[PDB]
């Protein structure tokens, strides 16, 4: 154990899992575009092997490159942002049925989003275009690399 | 050192770099769709840390899940395939200018492709749609997770 899972740096590789994922038609944290979410998601650091449940993380103490995460408040819900260098790659668990994000034809890099109630309940959101993997519940697995902080 | 970089298994995470990459309008190994290629690419196993220059691998000796890779011959050129669970995520090196693959609106998962001449020269190809990052030369970095063998 060298760097905590809470401490993030540019170039980190993250392996997320969203069991029993549901489909949200519009997500405010990404500017009103569809997303997949699970309330029992888990974040894996592939290189170091550390892991943590998303609902078990106090997200106001999470830092990226030495600084606190970028957070946005939408209709009384707090959303924390974990930017990535590139797009978030996700697929249905156990199958080769892959998904795609809202900016499938765009240079913009994707970013993980977390809702947290201040206690022990938290969601994890990933950008999607439609129900390409179904309406839910469905197990999905995501892979991405952590990128620099938003400007 | 437990498993060689030549040995691959489902769930492995690969960090590829395609320095001074060029743009190919049509790639046969992917059914005549554009690709990016570099002749000095490097394959990095993120979890185990092992790395190898793509030109330094005898690709006929590479195995995935205990079996040899799927290879195709197009106009006398041999292409080796490394399937991935999901799409290949790549971006320009040092920037947030991300790219997208040819099947951006498709469930189909992506797969890395390598050309090898039987000696010490080899290329690495990634699926793309257009010159979203330029015509080349340009440094790009790709991230993906190794998937099951083709059926």
């Amino acid at each position: 154990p060298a760097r905590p899972i809470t401490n993030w740096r540019s170039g980190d590789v993250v392996w997320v899992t969203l069991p029993s994922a549901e489909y949200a038609q519009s997500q405010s944290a990404m500017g009103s575009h569809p997303a997949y979410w699970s309330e029992e998601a888990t974040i894996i650091n592939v290189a170091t092997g550390q892991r943590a449940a998303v609902s078990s993380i106090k997200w106001d103490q999470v830092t990226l490159n030495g600084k606190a995460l970028h957070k946005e408040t939408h209709s009384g819900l707090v959303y924390y942002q974990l930017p990535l260098m590139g797009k978030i790659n996700f697929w249905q668990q156990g199958t080769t049925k892959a998904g795609y994000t809202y900016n499938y034809n765009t240079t913009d890099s994707d970013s993980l989003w977390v809702w947290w109630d201040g206690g022990s309940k938290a969601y994890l959101y990933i950008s999607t275009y439609t129900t390409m993997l179904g309406a839910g519940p469905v197990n999905i697995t995501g892979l991405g690399a952590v990128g620099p902080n938003p400007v | 050192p437990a498993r060689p970089i030549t040995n691959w298994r489902s769930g492995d995470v690969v960090w590829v770099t395609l320095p001074s990459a060029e743009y190919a309008q049509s790639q046969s190994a992917m059914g005549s769709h554009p690709a990016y290629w570099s002749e000095e690419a490097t394959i990095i196993n993120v979890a185990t840390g092992q790395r190898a220059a793509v030109s330094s691998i005898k690709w006929d000796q590479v195995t995935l899940n205990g079996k040899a890779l799927h290879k195709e011959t197009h106009s006398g050129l041999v292409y080796y395939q490394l399937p991935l669970m999901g799409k290949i995520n790549f971006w320009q090196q040092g920037t947030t200018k991300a790219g997208y693959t040819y099947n951006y609106n498709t469930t189909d998962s992506d797969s890395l492709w390598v050309w090898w001449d039987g000696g010490s020269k080899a290329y690495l190809y990634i699926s793309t749609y257009t010159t979203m990052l330029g015509a080349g030369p340009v440094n790009i970095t790709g991230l993906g997770a190794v998937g099951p063998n083709p059926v």
């Epitope: 060298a2 540019s10 030495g66 600084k67 | -």
Partner: antibody, heavy 128, light 103 residues
Framework: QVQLVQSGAEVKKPGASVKVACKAS????????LHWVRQAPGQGLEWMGI????????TYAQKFQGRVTMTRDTSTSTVYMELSSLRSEDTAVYYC???????????????????????WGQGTLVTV | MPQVPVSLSASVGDRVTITCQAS??????LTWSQQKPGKAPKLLIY???NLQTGVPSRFSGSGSGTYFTLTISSLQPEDIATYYC?????????FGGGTEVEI
């Protein structure tokens, strides 16, 4: 358990090569960068250079430009330091410290390598 | 990275503030370490303010960008040492200069 152990203290004459090793155990040797820091008995800490234990790249200091070479051994998880001219002012405790944050697989995308010094070595004293 | 206080002596139980100044913007890529006469320097906080696990809660960091500071709420006798601020922003790692604290 993460720990770095260094070789024993040495005494050298003016003009000689001193090779100091720093064994690594408890983690992935090739994943983390390593540094070398000198400590004169009265003065403060002087950073000397950095090493990539996966490819062997080095980045030395201007003062220690023509006199310092750093090497690694993946098989035994050890990093080496050598000082060549070795004048009397090179009497210091030499430290190996594991660097964190950027972990040698990003490459140049995270090589302003940012991370505090996870375990320092025990130290090795060299007297000229 | 000059350390403005070079040597400060304060009564047991007082508050100690030690400041570091950088030549350029660093962000939170600075750490505070404590060194006893014969030992390797021990790590107090990861970044500008991030306490190491196992270090008493007396030690607390602050500052960002260029001006950094180290605070100690109580001055128990175990505090007789030297403290250093070192940046890990740019390729040449540099250290502070040290403060000798007495009781």
């Amino acid at each position: 358990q993460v720990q770095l152990v260094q070789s024993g203290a040495e005494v050298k004459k003016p003009g000689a090569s001193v090779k100091v090793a720093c064994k690594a155990s408890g983690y992935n040797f090739i994943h983390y960068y390593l540094h070398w820091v000198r400590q004169a008995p009265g003065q403060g800490l002087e950073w000397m250079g950095i090493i990539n234990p996966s490819v062997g790249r080095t980045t030395y200091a201007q003062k220690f430009q023509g006199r310092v070479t750093m090497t690694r051994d993946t098989s035994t998880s050890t990093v080496y330091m050598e000082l060549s001219s070795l004048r009397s002012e090179d009497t210091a405790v030499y430290y190996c410290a594991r660097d964190v944050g950027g972990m040698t697989y990003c490459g140049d995308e995270c090589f302003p390598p940012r991370g505090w010094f996870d375990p320092w070595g025990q130290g090795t004293l060299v007297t000229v | 990275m000059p350390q403005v206080p070079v040597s400060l002596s304060a009564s047991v139980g007082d508050r100690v503030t030690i400041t570091c100044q950088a030549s350029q913007d660093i962000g939170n890529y600075l750490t505070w370490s404590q060194q006893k006469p014969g030992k390797a320097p021990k790590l107090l906080i990861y970044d500008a303010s991030n306490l190491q696990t196992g270090v008493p809660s007396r030690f607390s960091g602050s500052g960002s960008g260029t001006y950094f500071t180290l605070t100690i709420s109580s001055l128990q006798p175990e505090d007789i040492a030297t403290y250093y601020c070192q940046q890990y922003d740019n390729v040449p790692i540099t250290f502070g200069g040290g403060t000798e604290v007495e009781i």
